[PDB]
Amino acid sequence: RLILAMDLMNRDDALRVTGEVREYIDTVKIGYPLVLSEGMDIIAEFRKRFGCRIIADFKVADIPETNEKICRATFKAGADAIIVHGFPGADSVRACLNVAEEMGREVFLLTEMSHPGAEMFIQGAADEIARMGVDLGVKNYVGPSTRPERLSRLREIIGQDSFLISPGVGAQGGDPGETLRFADAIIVGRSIYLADNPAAAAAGIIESIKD
Amino acid sequence: MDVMNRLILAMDLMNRDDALRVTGEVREYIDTVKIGYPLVLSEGMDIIAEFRKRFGCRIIADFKVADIPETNEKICRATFKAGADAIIVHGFPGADSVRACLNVAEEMGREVFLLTEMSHPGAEMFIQGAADEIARMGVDLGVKNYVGPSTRPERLSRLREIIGQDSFLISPGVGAQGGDPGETLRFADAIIVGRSIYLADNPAAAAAGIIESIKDLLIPEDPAANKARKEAELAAATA
Ligand SMILES: O=c1cnn([C@@H]2O[C@H](COP(=O)(O)O)[C@@H](O)[C@H]2O)c(=O)[nH]1
C-alpha cells in the first residue's frame, strides 16, 4: 500500500535510496525529474536492481497522436503503467488506452491533483473527468490525499473494484490513515527520500499503515 | 520574440538519425525548432544539447509541464540545463504550478510559453471553457509567450485580445490537423508545423511551400508594422 515517488535527480542517489527502502515497497513511481536527468534507461535499471513494478508519472497531456508516441516509448522502455491527465479530453485519454491495451500495460487517470492550484480549474472538472474514465473503461486512478472528502467522492464514481492511488502524503500534508480509507495505496516521495534515514522513514509509514 | 519566416518546426520523429537529417534539410528556412517528448524519451535529453551544437536554432521544449509546483521546478531546471531556450507549460493545473516554472525561467534567463487552448477535438471538453481564464492568469503572472490553436481562429482572436500585441503567440495545428495559416497569422506571430514537413517525401520542399504560402499573405517583417496590422485584424474580427 506504499508506492515510492522517486524524484531524486541523479542516478547514484536514486538507486541508493530506493535500495535502502526496497523491503518496504514493491512499486516505484518514476517521473520526469529522474528521467530527464538520467534517461529512460533508468527504468530498465530499476527493474533489474529491484524487481519492482514501475509507474511512469509523465502526466501525459498532449494531442492524441503525440500521446500515442509518448506511451509507446514509455512502455518500450519497460514501464508497467503511465499516469495520464484527463483535462485534455477523451480522445487524448483513449490514445493512451489504445497503446496500453496493445502492450498489456496500464493507464492511470489523474482526476484531481493534490496541490493548492488544483482548486482553480481541475477540481471543478474532476467528477466529470472521473466519469469519463469510467465510460472509457479506465480501471486505475489517481486522486488527492490532501482532500479526503474529494477522494471519497472519486471512490463513489469509480466503484470499489477500480484501483486508486494517492499522492500528497507527508510533505503536502495528506494523512496516510484517512487517505487509505478510500485509496488502495499512497504515494510518498520527499518524506522518505529527503530523510537522512530513508529506511527508517519508510518503516515509520508502514507502521502507521499496519496500525 | 521574432521567429524566422514565422515557421517553427515540430520535430517529433523518434530517432536521432532521422530527426537530425530532416532538421538539416529544413534549417535554411527556420531559426526555431520545437522538440517534445516523442524525440526526448526515445533519444534522451542529450538530444537537445546535440541540436544546439549542430544547428544555430532556438529550441523550444514542448513538455506540456503539468505537475505540482515542486516537480515543475525540477522539470524546468533540468530542461534549461540541457540547453532549451524555452519550455511549454500547461495552465490547467493552476497559478502556483505556472509560477514555479516562471521562477526557474527568470533565474536561468530562459522563457516560458503558456499553453492556453489546445488544437485537437478533445480540447472542447474541458480546456476550451477554461482557456480565457488561463490566458488572463498568464497576463496576471507576467507571462509573455503563449500557445493557441490554429484550428479555431475565432478562439485565437479572443486569446490575442486578452494577451495583447506585446506578447508572442505561436500556433500548432497547421497541416495534419487542417488549420489555416492565413486566418491563423491574422492573430498569431508564428505557426508550428510537424507532420506536413517531417513526413513529406521531401521535407525541404514541404517547408519551402509553406513559406511561400506565408509570404503570399504579405505580413510585415517589421515588428511595429505587424503590430498595427494585427491590431486592425483584431478590430475587424471584433467589429
Ligand atoms: O496530484 C498530484 C499528482 N502527482 N503528484 C506527484 O506525486 C509525487 C508526490 O511527492 P511528495 O511525497 O514528495 O510530495 C511527486 O512526484 C509529484 O509530482 C503529486 O504530488 N500530486
Ligand SMILES: O=c1cnn([C@@H]2O[C@H](COP(=O)(O)O)[C@@H](O)[C@H]2O)c(=O)[nH]1
Ligand atoms: O494544442 C496543441 C499543443 N501542442 N501541439 C503539438 O504541436 C505539434 C503539432 O504537430 P503536427 O503539425 O504534426 O500536427 C505536435 O508536437 C503536438 O504535440 C499540438 O498539436 N496542439
